[PDB]
Amino acid sequence: TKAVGMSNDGRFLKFDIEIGRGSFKTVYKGLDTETTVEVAWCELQDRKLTKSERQRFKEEAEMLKGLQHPNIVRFYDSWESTCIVLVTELMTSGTLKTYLKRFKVMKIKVLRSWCRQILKGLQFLHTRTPPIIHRDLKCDNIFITGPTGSVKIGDLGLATLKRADFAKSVIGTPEFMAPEMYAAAYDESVDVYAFGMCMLEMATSEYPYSECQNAAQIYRRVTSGVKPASFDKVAIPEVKEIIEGCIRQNKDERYSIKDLLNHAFFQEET
Ligand SMILES: COc1cccc(-c2cc(C(=O)N(C)[C@@H]3CCN(Cc4ccc(Cl)cc4)C3)c3ccccc3n2)c1
Ligand SMILES: Nc1ncnc2c1ncn2[C@@H]1O[C@H](COP(=O)(O)OP(=O)(O)NP(=O)(O)O)[C@@H](O)[C@H]1O
Ligand SMILES: [Mn+2]
């Protein structure tokens, strides 16, 4: 295989082998010539980027490079070319979503094992300094790779660091706060909620709130107490109980990640 592109330091090679195509992302097979391991060479549509924002991207790419956990996709490097190139760990066995689109009843042994690996990944992110909130957890952003089909969370593009103050680098809080503005102070529990929906999808082989017609309808049913229609189809009571504790409307009522890892369901080792 001949290289059609190279990183400036000469470490990463690009091959003209397309392994994935997104709406704003094309992924090519690549090679890390320092380890002779292949990698994913991701080409992203570069937005109009202000110079401060380009500097924040480089700052955040250094943080991402320092992350190392068995259940998080490894991030190797980023740079600009003429688009933005991201080099990450290559996921050889596709996303969790494609497994659900091929089969209809996941076995509970796999549901327990794969969900436990997801929780270990989230626990890692949520215990960094500062904590990292993924914000974009879905079965398309969870990958399977390697001989034993290990589970890893990827695609941290929508992630954010957890902060305390209302505005960034400007202390203070508004007095005539609109209700939606008061609710904008969410935390890592939004990842618990998304995990509950992923677990619901894996347990039912159905997209949550499939019965709804558009994105707008999706909300009002949660708040009025109406869970997804597929929720009432979970046949394992312990599984249904875990999902319910994750998608509770009030965040303070939900599981934390550590509470989920201490659950009897995930404390089973078989
Ligand atoms: C393991 O990681 C991965 C895996 C796969 C993909 C990306 C990945 C990485 C980037 C990227 O390079 N940056 C700098 C982004 C800008 C926003 N920002 C939030 C954020 C802040 C702080 C922190 Cl600690 C973590 C995340 C990170 C990216 C950019 C644009 C579009 C998609 C992208 N996908 C990252
Ligand atoms: N690290 C990776 N290793 C191997 N294949 C990947 C990797 N990342 C992404 N892909 C493939 O590239 C495709 C496009 O990625 P992506 O843009 O995240 O999906 P998408 O179809 O745009 N949906 P969304 O998740 O909403 O962006 C994915 O569906 C994967 O098949
Ligand atoms: Mn994705």
The domain spans of the chain are 1-89, 90-270
Whose alpha carbon is nearest atom 17 of ligand 1?
Answer: 157
Which is it for strands 142-145 and 150-153: parallel, antiparallel or unpaired? antiparallel
The four Cα atoms 136, 140, 141, 142 give a dihedral, to 10 degrees, of 130
Q: Which atom of ligand 1 is nearest to the CA of 58?
A: 14
Method of structure determination: X-ray
H or E element that contains 152: strand 150-153
Cα of 41 from ligand 3 centre, angstroms: 14
Does the beta carbon of 44 sit less than 6 angstroms from any atom of ligand 1?
yes
SS3 212: coil
The Å distance, Cα 140 to ligand 2 centre, comes to 7
- Half-sphere exposure (CA, 13 Å, Cβ side) for 117? 22
Residue whose pair of structure tokens reads 């380009």 in the numeric block: 54
Are 145 and 70 in contact, with CB atoms under 8 Å apart?
no
Cβ atoms of 118 and 151 closer than 8 Å: yes
**CA 231/CA 244 separation, integer angstroms:** 8
What is the CA(207)–ligand 2 centre distance, in A?
18
For the chain, the residue count is 270
Which ligand approaches the C-alpha of residue 92 most closely? Answer: 2
Token code pair at residue 225:
């107490």
CB 104 within 8 A of CB 96: no
Please tell me the distance from the alpha carbon of residue 87 to that of residue 4, in angstroms, as a whole number.
15
Residue 119, CA distances (Å) to 79, 110, 179 in order:
30, 14, 31
Say if CB 160 and CB 78 are below 8 A apart. no
Instruction: Annotate the chain with DSSP letters as a single string.
Output: --EEEE-TTS-EEEEEEEEEE-SSEEEEEEEETTTTEEEEEEEEPPPP--HHHHHHHHHHHHHHHT---TTB--EEEEEE---EEEEEE--TT-BHHHHHTT-S---HHHHHHHHHHHHHHHHHHHTSSSPEE-----GGGEEEETTTTEEEE---TT-EE--SSSBTTB----SS--HHHHHT---THHHHHHHHHHHHHHHHTS-TTTT-SSHHHHHHHHHTT---TTGGG---HHHHHHHHHHS-SSGGGSPPHHHHHTSHHHH---
Residue 136 CB less than 6 A away from ligand 2: no
Ligand 2 center to 178 CA (angstroms): 37
Residue nearest to atom 30 of ligand 1 (CA): 157
Which pair of tokens denotes residue 16?
């003209």
CATH of domain 1-89: 3.30.200.20
- From CA 76, how far away is CA 40, in angstroms rounded? 10
**Other beta carbons less than 10 A from residue 87's beta carbon:** 22
Taking alpha carbons only, the member of 52, 122, 96, 128 closest to residue 203 is: 96
- The residues pairing with 38 across neighbouring beta strands, listed in sequence order, are 31
Atom of ligand 1 nearest to the CA of 61: 14
Is-contact 161 221, C-beta < 8 A? no
**Helix 189-204 × helix 108-126 angle, to 10°:** 170
If DSSP codes are grouped into helix, strand and coil, which group holds residue 154?
Answer: coil
270 Cα to the center of ligand 1, angstroms: 34
* Binding site membership of 27 for ligand 2 (Cβ less than 6 Å): yes
SS3 84: strand
Spell out the CATH class of 90-270.
Answer: mainly alpha
Q: Is 34 annotated to bind ligand?
A: no
156 is in an annotated binding site: yes
Backbone angles phi, psi at 27, to 5 degrees: -110, 130
Residue 49 to residues 12, 43, 137: CA-CA distances in angstroms? 25, 16, 25
Q: Determine the residue type at 236.
A: I
Q: How many CB atoms lie within 10 A of CB 175?
A: 5
Given resolution (angstroms): 2.0
Q: Computed from CA positions of residues 93, 95, 96, 102, in that sequence, does the dihedral angle turn out positive or negative? A: negative
Annotated binding residue at 89? Answer: yes
Q: Which of 41, 82, 77, 32 is nearest to 57 (CA)?
A: 77
Residue 237: partners with Cβ closer than 8 Å, 6 or more residues away: none
Q: What is the DSSP letter of 72?
A: B
- Nearest protein Cα to ligand 1, atom 26: 159
CB of 144 sitting under 6 A from ligand 2: no
| First-to-final CA distance of the chain | 42
100 lines ligand 2 (CB under 6 A): no
